[PDB]
Symmetry: C2
Subunit: 262 residues, 2 copies
């Protein structure tokens, strides 16, 4: 039902066999450096390794000058030591450029090319997939779903104008951003609508406020709630989920896949 | 959307506010008695209490002569010490009679009145809700879903003929019974069809072989897989889930409910 694969330079991701798991890398920085140090980069490599062991298919790694000094070294190490595609979690054009240069395969923009349109040009240039997330600096919606789909389309426009191929575009409803708890639930309820745009969807709900708002539970107690959102997401056609708890979420996805027939 | 409530003598269960959780009681018997002993009944009371604390709305308690001697004492204790409705998990008419006499509120038949039709008469008599599960002594299906719906309807017929009111009937697809792993998945995939019959559905997939078959994981490692089935089940309209891991499953249900708008 996807007539193509995701091309990620060295690695290739099939969109039909299974829900693809993107693991969120623990990024705890050192307080005694401006980036690159041994505890920093080593703790990140061991985390990537752990996530790779537990079922992850992608490792997600997230002022401007410092951001490069911190993130670049982590990409060099992980790409060497863990054979998995890497996404850079930035919205900044300059940051994205460095990260791909450093070895990152996918861009993960939380502003869907709206914060720094030049990022699209970076993406088209290096010919890497880009995840466009719904976002906005206000919460005033006429019709939440209709508006989201409009807003995302404004991102696709920017991406395509810059020269990004349809096949390198992935969408993200941006659950947990610019949405009240009730709005987040509504988007969850209506996720399948994003499918009409005809692009792979990545869901990213891992331990967010709205899960806490529902269950009344702090961040470290949101594995079950996250799981529910992952399940409903997969049912509604998501090609990727972005999660912290890779072992557990990887098992729920696999079971979902078997049931829905993916 | 349900224009009525479940009447359970002392307790009343609303079918619209939330997915109702039925907790599976640990029933470990004593090897030095034929039923009733202190370690037996006390370990069961503490388990019911634990499940009541973790979010359960119902406690499920499961030759003929001995079955009564073992199960009756557990119902007397739990109904006294835990203020929750109780279901007796039997298919035997004589057993069901005793259990309701002992204080059980709901019947949970794994043969949908087909093993002992008299059980329907017991249910109509005491005017208690009855859960009719799909089951059969063979695995030869022409059309799995079509056949299940036929078979269940043969149960409803028996129940109604015996005098059971429509409002005291609950259905159960019987996942994990008389079905190959692939058939179990198929039923999971097509669960919403059971809705056309117009009765509340209870799902009972807690840690079964097919979850293990998919994930390749032993019984004690099936919480995530169980969770996936609970999520998909709730999405497909289930009013109840029957589970071991009450704390976790209760949280996933609650989150599902918020998302689907229940």
């Amino acid at each position: 039902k996807w007539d193509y694969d995701l091309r990620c330079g060295e690695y290739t991701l099939n969109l039909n066999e299974k829900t693809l798991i993107m693991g969120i890398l623990n990024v705890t920085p050192d307080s005694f450096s401006d980036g690159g140090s041994y505890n920093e980069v080593d703790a990140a490599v061991r985390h990537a390794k752990e996530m790779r062991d537990e079922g992850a298919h992608i490792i997600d790694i997230g002022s401007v000058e410092e951001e490069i000094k911190r993130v670049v070294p982590m990409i060099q190490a992980v790409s060497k030591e863990v054979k998995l595609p890497i996404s850079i979690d930035t919205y900044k054009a300059e940051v994205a450029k460095q990260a791909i240069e450093a070895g990152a395969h996918i861009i993960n923009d939380i502003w869907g090319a709206k914060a720094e349109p030049k990022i699209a040009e970076v993406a088209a240039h290096y010919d890497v997939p880009i995840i466009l997330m719904h976002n906005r600096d206000n919460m005033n919606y006429r019709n939440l779903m209709a508006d989201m789909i409009a807003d995302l389309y404004d991102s696709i426009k920017i991406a395509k104008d810059a020269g990004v191929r349809d096949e390198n575009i992935i969408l993200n409803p941006g659950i947990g951003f610019a949405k009240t708890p009730e709005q987040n639930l509504e988007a969850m309820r209506n996720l399948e609508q994003l499918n009409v745009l005809g692009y792979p969807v990545l869901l990213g709900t891992s331990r967010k406020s709205f899960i806490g708002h529902v269950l009344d539970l702090p961040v470290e107690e949101r594995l079950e709630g996250t799981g529910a959102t992952v399940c409903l997401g997969i049912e509604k056609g998501c090609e990727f989920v972005r999660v912290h708890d890779v072992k557990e979420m990887s098992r729920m996805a696999k079971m979902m896949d078997a049931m829905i027939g993916k």
